[PDB]
Amino acid sequence: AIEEGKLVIWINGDKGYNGLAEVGKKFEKDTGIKVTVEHPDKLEEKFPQVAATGDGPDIIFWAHDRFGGYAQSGLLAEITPDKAFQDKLYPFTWDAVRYNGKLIAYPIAVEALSLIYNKDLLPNPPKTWEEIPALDKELKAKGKSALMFNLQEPYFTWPLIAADGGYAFKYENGKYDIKDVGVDNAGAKAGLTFLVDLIKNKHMNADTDYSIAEAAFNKGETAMTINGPWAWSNIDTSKVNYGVTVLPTFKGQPSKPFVGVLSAGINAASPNKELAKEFLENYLLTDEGLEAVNKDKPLGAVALKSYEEELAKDPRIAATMENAQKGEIMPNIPQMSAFWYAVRTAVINAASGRQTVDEALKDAQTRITK
Numbered sequence: 001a002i003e004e005g006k007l008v009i010w011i012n013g014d015k016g017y018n019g020l021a022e023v024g025k026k027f028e029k030d031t032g033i034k035v036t037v038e039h040p041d042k043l044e045e046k047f048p049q050v051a052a053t054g055d056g057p058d059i060i061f062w063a064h065d066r067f068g069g070y071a072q073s074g075l076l077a078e079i080t081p082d083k084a085f086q087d088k089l090y091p092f093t094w095d096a097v098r099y100n101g102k103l104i105a106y107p108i109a110v111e112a113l114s115l116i117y118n119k120d121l122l123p124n125p126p127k128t129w130e131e132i133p134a135l136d137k138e139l140k141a142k143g144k145s146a147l148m149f150n151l152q153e154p155y156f157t158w159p160l161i162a163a164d165g166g167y168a169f170k171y172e173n174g175k176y177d178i179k180d181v182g183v184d185n186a187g188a189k190a191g192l193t194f195l196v197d198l199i200k201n202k203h204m205n206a207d208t209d210y211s212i213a214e215a216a217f218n219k220g221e222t223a224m225t226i227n228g229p230w231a232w233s234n235i236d237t238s239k240v241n242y243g244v245t246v247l248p249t250f251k252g253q254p255s256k257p258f259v260g261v262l263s264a265g266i267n268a269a270s271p272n273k274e275l276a277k278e279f280l281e282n283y284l285l286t287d288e289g290l291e292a293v294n295k296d297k298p299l300g301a302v303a304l305k306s307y308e309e310e311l312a313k314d315p316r317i318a319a320t321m322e323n324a325q326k327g328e329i330m331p332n333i334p335q336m337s338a339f340w341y342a343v344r345t346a347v348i349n350a351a352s353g354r355q356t357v358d359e360a361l362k363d364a365q366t367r368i369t370k
């Protein structure tokens with residue numbers, strides 16, 4: 001039934017747990033309360049299991065969308081940050097941790113796709129998607145392509161599809177309307193058609209995936225790619241001179257990438273909810289706290305305004321946030337899963353010629369609203 005008087009924190013092995021332990025150290029140094037950081041295997045699957053029996057960690061870190069299912073089972077305590085603290089974070093990040101009208105976690109980091117370009121091949125990247133075909137023609141004359149990115153996952157193609165109007169679920173007043181889905185509308189239609197046209201016109205290949213695109217950019221064969229902060233470390237080793245900027249606009253409208261927010265939830269069965277609040281609010285979500293973690297392993301962009309403004313000195317992080325604010329938080333409802341699978345199938349089929357754009361989207365829409 002969770003031990004009282006200390007804090008047990010669970011965070012994934014690919015995050016800065018060592019850096020976080022540094023924050024726990026200061027917490028114990030000031031309060032005399034011990035903080036233990038653990039990163040068990042398959043922790044996202046373990047948490048709902050142990051938390052269901054009134055056990056598990058006091059605090060759990062994970063992408064915000066997975067917290068919707070946890071909150072649905074009443075695994076997370078409703079947090080109580082005052083207005084002063086709420087003003088400390090970007091407002092859109094608070095939307096990522098709200099379930100059934102209640103705040104159930106503290107936003108920590110922000111991640112979204114950005115346009116990654118090769119400064120030596122394209123020092124002045126295109127501001128619009130419409131400009132890409134002509135650029136590809138010019139680059140192809142050199143044996144290079146203009147753009148290569150993962151076309152197998154809807155997460156990567158959606159930014160373009162949503163640009164002129166596509167959307168997963170209408171987020172009206174604090175909640176998502178599962179009856180209002182925007183996959184089979186005019187905007188999504190135009191976006192997908194543009195994508196399909198790039199393929200038909202030989203500017204992109206329907207088979208291009210993550211690994212294919214990554215190697216191409218890393219070897220200087222393509223001038224641009226679309227990826228997240230998680231991929232930077234795999235480019236840095238490549239030595240290629242790259243930059244990260246805002247995604248291209250389509251029909252004059254900004255691309256709208258989905259946003260993932262690393263969040264920290266408090267176990268509903270924790271008898272240390274107040275200690276958790278103190279740690280998260282006044283130790284972790286401060287410039288000194290986030291610096292400790294970030295310095296260990298990059299968080300990318302962060303939810304805390306003050307520190308983000310400091311990190312933004314890195315154009316890659318600034319671009320990450322610019323795209324995120326123009327994007328949409330990933331919905332934390334069960335239906336979002338149906339959205340991913342249906343749209344994944346629609347884009348694949350439309351790109352291969354298996355389905356026309358109209359039928360692909362209509363079919364996706366019809367299944368998502370079921």
Ligand SMILES: OC[C@@H](O)[C@@H](O[C@H]1O[C@H](CO)[C@@H](O[C@H]2O[C@H](CO)[C@@H](O)[C@H](O)[C@H]2O)[C@H](O)[C@H]1O)[C@H](O)[C@@H](O)CO
Nearest residue numbers: 014063065111152153154155156210228230231260340
């Ligand atoms: O290939 C590396 C990625 O898995 C990367 O995660 C990022 O990209 C995926 C998309 O492939 C994002 O997943 C989201 O979107 C897909 C639909 O395309 C859904 O099936 C997922 O449920 C949804 O989360 C992911 O959010 C994004 O971080 C790496 O894992 C990276 O996170 C860590 O190296």
